[PDB]
Structure 1
Amino acid sequence: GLKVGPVPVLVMSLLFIASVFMLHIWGKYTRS
């Protein structure tokens, strides 16, 4: 199956955190 390592998992976690952060920023600056 799809075999992933520790660094890919860390990158995915950081990118998910960043994506949520951008979602918040985009919402805040589109309500303006």
Structure 2
Amino acid sequence: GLKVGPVPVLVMSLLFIASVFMLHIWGKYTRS
């Protein structure tokens, strides 16, 4: 399939981390 290198893996991991952080922030803003 999509054969990525190491730097794309780091970018994907950081993007997933930022996605979880954005989920937390959106939940905070919508609930409060």
Provide TM-score, normalisation by structure 1: 0.90
Which consecutive residues of structure 2, in runs of 5 or more, have no partner in the other structure? none
Structure 1 vs Structure 2 CA RMSD: 0.7
Which consecutive residues of structure 1, in runs of 5 or more, have no partner in the other structure? none
Among all aligned residue pairs of Structure 1 and Structure 2, give the percentage whose two residues are the same amino acid: 100
Q: Displaced runs of 4+ in structure 1, greater than 3 A?
A: none
Aligned residues: 32
